Ligand binder design. Structure first.
Ligand SMILES: C[C@@H]1O[C@@H](OC[C@H]2O[C@@H](OCCc3ccc(O)c(O)c3)[C@H](O)[C@@H](O)[C@@H]2OC(=O)/C=C/c2ccc(O)c(O)c2)[C@H](O)[C@H](O)[C@H]1O
Ligand SMILES: O=c1ccn([C@@H]2O[C@H](COP(=O)(O)OP(=O)(O)O)[C@@H](O)[C@H]2O)c(=O)[nH]1
Length: 450
């Protein structure tokens, strides 16, 4: 079998481009040739991530200026929400530049997600298409699917959004109440068209749908998506990047070593979230209330000079050496692997969820976004490997709610903790079994050949 030539054209955001590159590295490792079309600024930021320079080539695509687009705006990270429709309109405008590159590259398969016009080019240039999604399967299945009717004229109510589309496999992986607002984007404008129109065209135009998940986690959701669009669904596995080697920072190791094994509660909310000052103070107070050792790695609240400035009065003093609150970036994998760490409080982002699943720590979830809430419902309610902190109307969580969730997984007495620990242990063993990740990548490649 001759090796494949795959072209990737992701939506212009670091959160989309990076998983596409990680998949490209796994494909190149197998000998396949990848051409990746991205703006230069993303190229400058992520270019070091290419581990196979002869197999993986970057092609710079220019983001055309359009009315309302800030100067030199190329990715979602450059603009805030007011520029979102200009950025999408500019993204659609690289169609002609993409067409010329595709006419030259002549790929066998093109990967895309938000560029719904790629299948039209698939007809003109002659290539197969996969609509490959970095978002979780349950979010796709509960949202933009033909079984859900989204009116063009009027927005969906909170009720319509909370109601899962007919045939949706799970009664557990659902949004509840005010959480439904987190799904409201599926109906919003996105450039010249509404988001759901763009995703519907993307899903229906492709030859197959690609999802970065595994069947053991999200199998019924993938089957629902396959039937809803009458498309095959190819599961790539999570395609997790290689763990960063190198030792843990010596001061962290020394501070962790003062504590007993599995006794330290670690907390981090990803590299995208910045908490408001009032939620931040409520969180650090919730960790103090537990009386257990804690390591909190969170960005300082926006507009705070320092972490110590943002802290509530008297916090530093009451806590002493029992807890650390650190504004800097930390080596999350190494800290979690440290014997002293016993609990992980996270927002259930994609990276943190898989790191939680693969680790030996207890799992405490404080989701914010719609996908995080759904992954939390999968982990806490269906799989029962985690506990979810109770939250308020805006996603607000009280210090007592956070404290109770931590004690419920940390106390040896707690029956809830023993159950999630046991269920967690089963799943960890499945996901770490040797060759489990590689089987998905190999099976992904074979489906591409079909
Ligand atoms: C602010 C974002 O706006 C919605 O997300 C919609 C999309 O928005 C994009 O951002 C580019 C525009 C932008 C740039 C800077 C900002 O400060 C800002 O607020 C908005 C992101 O890059 C996409 O990952 C995101 O897709 C998705 O996340 C969902 C994709 C999806 C969802 C359901 C489906 O069925 C499906 O096929 C795909 C949701 O509210 C997200 O939670 C939230 O992070
Ligand atoms: O202090 C930190 C915070 C985050 N991460 C890493 O950042 C990645 C992205 O986090 P996640 O996907 O969970 O959330 P997101 O950043 O996507 O919002 C994960 O692999 C974490 O290990 C890290 O190394 N140190």
């Amino acid at each position: 079998k001759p090796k494949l030539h795959i072209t990737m054209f992701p939506w212009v955001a670091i959160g989309h481009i990076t998983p596409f590159i990680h998949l490209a590295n796994e494909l190149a490792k197998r000998g396949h040739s990848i051409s990746i079309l991205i703006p230069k600024k993303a190229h400058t930021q992520l270019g070091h991530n290419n581990l196979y320079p002869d197999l993986i080539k970057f092609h710079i695509v220019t983001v055309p200026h359009v009315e309302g687009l800030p100067a030199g705006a190329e990715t979602a990270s450059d603009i805030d929400i007011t520029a979102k429709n200009p950025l999408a309109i500019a993204f659609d405008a690289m169609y002609e530049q993409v067409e010329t590159l595709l006419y030259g590259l002549k790929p066998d398969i093109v990967f895309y997600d938000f560029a719904d016009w790629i299948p039209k080019l698939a007809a003109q240039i002659g290539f197969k298409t996969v609509c490959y999604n970095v978002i979780c399967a349950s979010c796709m299945a509960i949202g933009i699917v033909p079984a859900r009717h989204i009116p063009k004229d009027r927005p969906l109510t909170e009720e319509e959004l909370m109601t899962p589309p007919e045939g949706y496999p799970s009664s557990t992986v659902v949004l509840r109440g005010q959480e439904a607002r987190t799904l409201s984007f599926i109906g919003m404008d996105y450039g010249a068209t509404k988001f759901d129109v763009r995703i519907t065209a993307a899903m229906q135009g492709c030859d197959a749908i690609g999802i970065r998940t595994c069947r053991e986690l999200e199998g019924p959701m993938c089957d629902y998506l396959s039937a809803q669009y009458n498309k095959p669904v190819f599961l790539s596995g999570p395609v997790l990047p290689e763990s960063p080697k190198g030792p843990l920072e010596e001061k962290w190791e020394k501070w962790l070593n003062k504590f007993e094994p599995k006794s330290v509660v670690y907390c981090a909310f990803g590299s995208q979230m910045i908490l408001q000052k009032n939620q931040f103070q409520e969180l650090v107070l919730g960790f103090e209330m537990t009386g257990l050792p804690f390591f909190v790695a969170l960005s300082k609240p926006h507009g705070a000079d320092s972490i110590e400035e943002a802290l509530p009065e008297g916090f530093l003093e009451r806590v002493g050496d029992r807890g650390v609150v650190h504004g800097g970036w930390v080596q999350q994998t190494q800290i979690l692997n440290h014997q002293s760490v016993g609990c992980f409080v996270s927002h259930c982002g994609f990276g943190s969820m898989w790191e939680s699943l693969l680790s030996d720590s207890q799992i405490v979830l404080v989701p914010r976004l719609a996908d995080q809430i759904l992954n939390t419902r999968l982990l806490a309610e269906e799989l029962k490997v985690a506990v979810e902190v109770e939250r308020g109307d805006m996603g607000w969580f009280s210090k007592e709610d956070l404290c109770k969730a931590i004690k419920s997984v940390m106390d040896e007495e707690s029956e809830v903790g023993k159950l999630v620990k046991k269920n967690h242990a089963k799943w960890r063993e499945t996901l770490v079994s040797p060759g489990y990740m590689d089987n998905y990548l190999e099976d992904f490649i074979q489906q591409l050949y079909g």
